[PDB]
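ping. complex inputs:
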Amino acid sequence: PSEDFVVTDRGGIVENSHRVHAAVVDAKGRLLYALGNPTRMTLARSAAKPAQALAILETEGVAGYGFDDADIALMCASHSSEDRHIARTRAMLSKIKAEEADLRCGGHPSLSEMVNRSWIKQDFIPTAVCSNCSGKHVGMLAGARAIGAGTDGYHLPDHPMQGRVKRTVAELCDLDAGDVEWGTDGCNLPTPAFPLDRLGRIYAKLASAADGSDAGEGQSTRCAALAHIFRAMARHPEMVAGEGRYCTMLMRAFDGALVGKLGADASYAIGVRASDATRQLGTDGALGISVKIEDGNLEMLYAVVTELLERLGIGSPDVRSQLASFHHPQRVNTMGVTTGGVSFPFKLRGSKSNVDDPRLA
Amino acid sequence: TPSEDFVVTDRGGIVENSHRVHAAVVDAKGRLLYALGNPTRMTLARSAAKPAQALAILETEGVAGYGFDDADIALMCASHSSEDRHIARTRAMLSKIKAEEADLRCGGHPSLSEMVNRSWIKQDFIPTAVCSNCSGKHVGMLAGARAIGAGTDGYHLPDHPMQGRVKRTVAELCDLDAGDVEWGTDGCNLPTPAFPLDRLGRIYAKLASAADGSDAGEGQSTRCAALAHIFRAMARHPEMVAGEGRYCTMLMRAFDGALVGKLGADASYAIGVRASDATRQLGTDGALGISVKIEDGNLEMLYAVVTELLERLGIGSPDVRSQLASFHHPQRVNTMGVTTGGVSFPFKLRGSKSNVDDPRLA
Ligand SMILES: [Zn+2]
Ligand SMILES: [Zn+2]
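pong. complex structure:
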């Protein structure tokens, strides 16, 4: 594996450096481009959420609860805990006739500084319904009810809802159960680790499913549901994150061409629908991108992800300029003097078919 | 060829994040005794340079005249939390030199303390210059500029005579030629130096050595007396150097005068340790300096590694170091109070030749 870094400087003097791992894969998970170790065993954290939403959506009779595309986007969310997110979470609890008291996720400081500031003013202590993963938890309760397993312990790994989740994640990764490791997340659910490239493969399968559905092609019920999750995230991107959040601004910029999702401690996944851009990357289908910053730095993650989209020619300069504040983190001191910047000396490595493209592959 | 030395975090035994560690442990002459990573890494010292800047201030002819006390000198050496007491002391220091807040050329920022920020956020308080974590250093630089007769205007600019004194003093404490120290601009809008990481340790060894010389009642150069004075001000006013719940403050209170420690932004740290049974056991007959950089800049990981280093080096009793356990072993507890993982130190100290294969390295 290569020595691929994002580097910060102060007056040209190196401040911090951050090791970058990245996989770019086709609809079958074949590796097209890489940084660092693209097979790094990686906790996907919230970037696993679409796989968890598929498990929920494949549960007999969850159709019955009348979840809309905005609700599915919230199941797929690390939301900012804005009032709209809390209100959708409550409306989802009503649709399954459950109560806040059924939630086994806990409250935390908002992922949005402006939300935190609102909460600090109101001396508000966040509760379970405020969890960035609240949507997932309501989705898991819904699954738990529909299975007839009861909602008690729906979060526990031996609950049948979690056995559906583990099985679904392994299958989307094309891995044996033994190849997927499990810990416990901040929101108190089981959370998977698998090779970084397989997160890319999950998202390439979402984008691939969207293309199959749109092409009015016949589709397995699994593929139909993946198309539905893609559409839900792309068309309700504020539900997936919130105002000023990377994921939201990324998916609004791309206006349905891709979905993207943060994982805590600096993983990211994108599924890109077949396009002129993906064709020039030497695949005729959809594409998956997965990234991990080794040290967990989110600011560096969003810079690297945006740089990779630019390097890969995904969207136009004009679409990607909506993310300029993320691409090029500001280094402006307390007196408004620019003191340095962020550089990307990493160099994409290519599959054999991409080797020696001077477009730095 | 520098070692692959990491602090590693896990979730259920599964690697989450890893952070590359650089560290130097040096004697009073700056000779390297132990290392992690690249002990000579060119490193922006940021706020860890503050004792050297304070020396430039205290060696300025006539600064004595203003009657700065030890708590004031600690504030010069501070990255404070912008507690009311730090803002009050900054105003008292401006009073001693008859300057106004408007003369400061640092800007306000969100407090280094979450509790202070929450207080400010609640009162929609916009922090101003006097609130800067570097406010004490800036008042000291203004004081130096005034006493030079250069005048306070442009005191912060690299070509101002006060910054000339700073740049010379930093290179001198490092035992480096001027061209071996690089300069950028800090968050507080002052020049800020970069030099090999071991020279940060060397500065802190010299602070502690000076303190030893002073307390031994040995004859000392005016510079060594000034270094001793800085050591004493930091060790005896540790709340002024940082604040409530801050690593630097808790570390220096725990050690009760045996060492000083100081953060630099983007996760550098420096400690100067007075000659002790511990330093003797480490194979040196004088004071010791420790300098650390976390390559990716993570402060939580810096405090964990620094504390782990003091433990591996036997500096302090386990009881003294236990005051820092919350920093040493960062908690990994989820929103429902379940422990989900922790932090490991699989890095391994490398020794000078006289320290090779001491099994206490691990
Ligand atoms: Zn979660
Ligand atoms: Zn400063």
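Chain B has one domain: 6-361.
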